[PDB]
Amino acid sequence: ATFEIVNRCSYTVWAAASKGDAALDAGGRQLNSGESWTINVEPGTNGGKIWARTDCYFDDSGSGICKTGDCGGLLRCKRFGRPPTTLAEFSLNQYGKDYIDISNIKGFNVPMDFSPTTRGCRGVRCAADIVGQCPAKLKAPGGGCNDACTVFQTSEYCCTTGKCGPTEYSRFFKRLCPDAFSYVLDKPTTVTCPGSSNYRVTFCPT
């Protein structure tokens, strides 16, 4: 499956793509404002994620640091990124169907549209100014808007026991982005697409 990753932000981002225990495609790449990076994701990939990283430095070996979304200091991500990260999430070819969503469960750093480029389903978007409106207690000094599990480490925010309800903090993300997951047991905003669809992830779509 092909994912076109487009940076419409006025600032550089370092795109990242991982399924948690391995890179997807090259795993990461710099995207200056306006640049597009097309990656190939193996059919059947379960639990893949694409995200933006901001304010990165990398040396000639591809090692360094990012202020949001850092994946163990690597340009080419093999693991998931450090919150806060707006997440494009997907599982492909699951009994004939693809499943996609956007999630704020690990916070928000960059606005994002996640849309199919092939027929049969709709896209999702979280493009509100979540960082500008972020509750004071959730603001990440390094940049972005942390989720409340990252900040407070409670069973209720992290849904540790598989029982948890919405919270003042989850309702903040949900009010600004109704079509993204705001907490672990949120009413699902997952979109079912035809198996083997292709996609585009656009940072700063508006």
Full residue range of the structural domain in which residue 78 is found? 1-206
Q: Are 202 and 112 in contact (CB under 8 A)?
A: yes
Pairwise CA distance, residues 44 & 59, whole Å: 34
User: Long-range contacts made by residues 40-44, C-beta under 8 angstroms, separation at least 24?
Assistant: 40/1, 40/2, 40/3, 41/1, 41/2, 41/3, 41/17, 41/90, 41/92, 42/1, 42/92, 43/1, 43/92, 43/93, 43/196, 44/92, 44/93
* Dist. CA 145–CA 206, nearest whole Å: 19
Q: Domain total for the chain?
A: 1
Bridge partner list, 172: none
In contact, 26 and 39? CB cutoff 8 Å: yes
State which amino acid sits at residue 35.
E
Cα within 13 Å of Cα(1), Cβ side? 28
Resolution of the experimental structure, in angstroms: 1.7
Check the CA dihedral 160-164-167-172 and report its sign.
positive
> H-helix or E-strand containing 125?
strand 124-126
CA gap 110, 55 in Å, rounded: 12
Rounded Cα distance between 108 and 146, Å, is 7
- Listed in sequence order, the residues at least 6 apart from 160 whose beta carbon sits closer than 8 Å to its beta carbon are none
